[PDB]
């Protein structure tokens, strides 16, 4: 992971089905396709992703102080580690099959659902700056304090002003 970013979302965002966790990780990494016969790269690409992660442990990293603070030559700080979970819980209304009356019929039950990436995009080798802009835009959208809303990319859109093709139903 060339770039990595950890953001803490609020209760309104966590309530959604796409943000069932409380921490979001944004990453940018480079992929290489290797020739099966001999080690020789054939194609290269950059990937921008975003997953809801959960804490699994801790580790020690160098301390980087900010303006008011000052650090020792060998000062270190401990930060948590994150991983992508397989499933996350939800709370949905239900009914008790063996309710004896009118007071124990309606209840709440918990279910597990599959976790899917928030963002998954692929960029070519000669488009590093566009990938960097996309990653920065995702980070800014998360910093604004709401859900990720803009996924538009100019390269993958259909032509504009071609009335003979855009007249067909799209809903």
């Amino acid at each position: 992971m060339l770039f990595k970013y950890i953001h803490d979302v609020n209760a309104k965002v966590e309530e959604g089905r796409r943000y069932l966790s409380d921490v979001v990780r944004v990453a940018l990494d480079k992929e290489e396709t290797t020739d099966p016969d001999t080690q020789e790269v054939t194609s290269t690409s950059y990937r921008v992703t975003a997953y809801p992660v959960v804490q699994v442990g801790e580790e020690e990293v160098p301390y980087i102080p900010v303006h008011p603070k000052t650090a020792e030559p060998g000062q270190k700080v401990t930060v948590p580690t994150y991983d992508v979970p397989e499933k996350l819980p939800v709370l949905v209304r239900g009914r008790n099959p063996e309710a004896t009356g009118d007071y124990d019929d309606h209840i709440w039950v918990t279910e597990e659902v599959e976790v899917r990436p928030l963002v998954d995009e692929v960029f070519k080798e000669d488009e590093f700056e566009k990938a960097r802009l996309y990653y920065e835009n995702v980070a800014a959208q998360l910093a604004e304090g709401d859900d990720i809303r803009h996924y538009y990319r100019k390269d993958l859109d259909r032509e504009a002003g071609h009335y003979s093709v855009s007249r067909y139903p799209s809903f």
Binding site: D147, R149, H150, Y152, D157, A160, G161, S166, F171
Partner: protein, 52 residues
């Protein structure tokens, strides 16, 4: 006279004429109203954004 007269000019007398104020003239167009997305959203769901 074995050649044409003025009455044989048709297109030049019918095309509308507008005065020009510069060697370069500019005008703007509206290509489309939006993209081909979906419109159905759901109860309490924020709709997608769109641009012209």
């Amino acid at each position: 006279n074995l050649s044409f007269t003025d009455q044989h000019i048709k297109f030049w007398k019918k095309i509308p004429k507008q005065k020009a104020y510069s060697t370069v003239e500019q005008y703007g167009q509206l290509l489309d109203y939006g993209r081909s997305q979906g419109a159905f959203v759901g109860e309490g769901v924020l709709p997608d954004t769109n641009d012209s």
